[PDB]
Each structure stands twice: as C-alpha cells, then as structure tokens.
C-alpha cells in the first residue's frame, strides 16, 4: 500500500514537470534571475555611495 502511495510521489514529480505542457518552465523563472542579479547590481551601486 505504501508503495502505491510512492506512485503518488511519482504523480507529484509528474505534476512539477506538467507546467511545461502548459508552456511554463525555467524561461519564466529566468526573468526573476536576470531581475535579481540586477537587484544586487543596483543595491551594490547604492551602497557604493
């Protein structure tokens, strides 16, 4: 029975990939990266004052 519940673990693993069939992936989170690196750049430029 526990092993069947591990197949629910495989279902959640499927579900985290599933956004890609909906056209969501790393290309979305990549924006927050390009942004957050820019946030560190401007906070560094501020503290350089």
């Amino acid at each position: 029975f526990e092993r069947m519940e591990n197949k629910v673990l495989d279902m959640e693993a499927t579900s985290q990939a599933a956004g890609e069939l909906a056209g969501f992936g790393i290309e979305n989170q990549f924006a927050q990266l390009e942004a957050s690196s820019g946030v560190e750049d401007e906070l560094a430029a501020l503290k350089a004052s």
Binding site: Q16, N28, Q29, Q32
Partner: protein, 56 residues
Amino acid sequence: RTMSENLRRNLAALEAKISEAKTKKNMLQARAKAAKANAELQQTLGGLGTSSATSA
C-alpha cells in the same frame, strides 16, 4: 529548501501577474473613457459637418 524556493518563484509570479493586471485595469479603463472623449473630439471635427448641413 530546493522545491520550497520554486514555490517562492511560483508565488512571486502570482503576485506579479495579478498586480500587473490591476495596473492594466486602471490604464485600460482610463484609456477607454479617455478614448470615448477623443472619439467625441473626432466627432467634433465631424461637428463642422453637422453645421455644414444647414450652413448651405
């Protein structure tokens, strides 16, 4: 920590899309009412035709 931070990406996306949709609501509504007035300005350029209709 790894999957939790991906939930922070997801939550950061929820608030971003929702908040941007709220500023779109303001911009679009304002632009729509404004456009009704600007359309009435085009119509007012057409008002010169409505006076022409008895200026003859």
